[PDB]
Swiss-Prot record, chains A, B, C, D:
Transfers electrons from cytochrome c551 to cytochrome oxidase. It comes from Pseudomonas aeruginosa (strain ATCC 15692 / DSM 22644 / CIP 104116 / JCM 14847 / LMG 12228 / 1C / PRS 101 / PAO1). One of its GO terms (molecular function) is transition metal ion binding. This is Azurin. The keyword Iron does not apply. Disulfide bonds join 3-26. InterPro entries: Azurin, BlueCu_1, BlueCu_1_BS, Cu-binding_ET, Cupredoxin. The gene is azu. NCBIfam families: azurin. Residues 1-128 form the Plastocyanin-like domain. It is found in: Periplasm. The keyword Disulfide bond applies. Keywords: Copper, Disulfide bond, Electron transport, Metal-binding, Periplasm, Signal, Transport.
Amino acid sequence: AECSVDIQGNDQMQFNTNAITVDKSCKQFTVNLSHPGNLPKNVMGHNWVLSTAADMQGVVTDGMASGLDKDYLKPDDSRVIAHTKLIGSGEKDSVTFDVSKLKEGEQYMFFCTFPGASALHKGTLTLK
Amino acid sequence: AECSVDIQGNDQMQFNTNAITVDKSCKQFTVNLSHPGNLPKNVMGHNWVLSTAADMQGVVTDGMASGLDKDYLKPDDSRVIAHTKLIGSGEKDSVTFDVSKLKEGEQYMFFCTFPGASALHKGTLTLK
Amino acid sequence: AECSVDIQGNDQMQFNTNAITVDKSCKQFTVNLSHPGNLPKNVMGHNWVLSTAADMQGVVTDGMASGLDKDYLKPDDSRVIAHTKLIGSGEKDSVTFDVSKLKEGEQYMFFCTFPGASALHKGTLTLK
Amino acid sequence: AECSVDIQGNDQMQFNTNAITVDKSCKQFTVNLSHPGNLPKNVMGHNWVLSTAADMQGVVTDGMASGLDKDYLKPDDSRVIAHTKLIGSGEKDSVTFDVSKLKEGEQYMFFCTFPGASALHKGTLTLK
Ligand SMILES: [Cu+2]
Ligand SMILES: [Cu+2]
Ligand SMILES: [Cu+2]
Ligand SMILES: [Cu+2]
Ligand SMILES: [Cu+2]
Ligand SMILES: [Cu+2]
Ligand SMILES: [Cu+2]
Ligand SMILES: [Cu+2]
């Protein structure tokens, strides 16, 4: 099974996917985030952040509240299972995490914590 | 508030969204389903079907079993709150339903009953 | 004095207060519960339930055992002094009760009976 | 004789069967429980629990009262002859037990201890 996915965020505050599957045979999984937009990180930043569905709102709220210099993530936020850095136009960033950190049955969500994010700038992550 | 949404189904057996919001002040709500793919209805049919989250399994199971000639919906399925017809490439169909059929605190799902739909070929419909 | 308080429950199974005061000059008192989270009632429900400290465990235990269809409250539970209904993301519910139901010297607790509730998902209610 | 059975729980709080037969020549018997529903364990959990018909009431009452974190079973319940873990959508669990635990002339029941179970959410297990 493939153990990596390629995700893009654009100038419209949109990922080009709303659902990621992670095969349970993968020991590590890698998300390759890129930004094919024109706008710089300060005005149109994207990151890819993973948490349980219950923690998502808190991660996003405290993250926006932390500011750009903190990558819009609260420091030492244990709710964050994995994340990329925040990136602007023409940048890329990959995160590899251990799939064992995921549990069968639990509900996981991926999302971006740059302020202005819509209710749909998020997605499901599911084991298969 | 707006009381309609445009949904597209594609040639990879997907919807372009997995989350629809229905403003609570809407008396009626309209889903505009379109099929911009190239594949005909008998190989890549899409419908948009709404039920409670708990009823989705039964609607999907009985519907897929009812055949192309019934639009893959069990006849007289009272669990189906609203639905479009099954469409192929270049077809469109709209459904309008009364928002009083939705109840606060209840969870609702939209999905597709054409055989072969993955577990991810569905979404949440939520009152806001 | 004021005879109302505004309480919020989130996606972390948390209230935003652990202590409510009720002025003895209030003839009625109103709890305004809201759910600013993103998660639906079936996975992340909240209610606000009031009982003596001694009855709380039994209310909670028999409530969880009653299931979601009964709002996680045992029917005809005479230990329940006052309660809101169970609510999910985007919902609100208010309960007004007669302050005369409270007696000086007695210890009262407020809490939530949705399962998974931690031993901190409660709070004191005190006359002043 | 075959010494195993496949059992499904669904999103309507039901098993697919209400009657299991265990051939008396079986030395071990295996129950393969699965959850083809869409709803998670905290909203639509299923377990398969075996006891005498007389012990069913106590196991259910004590179990449902024991909470999601104990899989809705009283700790160290000597009445439980065999059980699967509690599973949600997409999960599966198997239990194998010694048939010498069953005695001729006794009556046995299987059931589920997830709160909200109906009186029909159960079945007979019979030596044959
Ligand atoms: Cu592989
Ligand atoms: Cu973003
Ligand atoms: Cu309007
Ligand atoms: Cu479809
Ligand atoms: Cu006053
Ligand atoms: Cu609560
Ligand atoms: Cu045999
Ligand atoms: Cu069950």
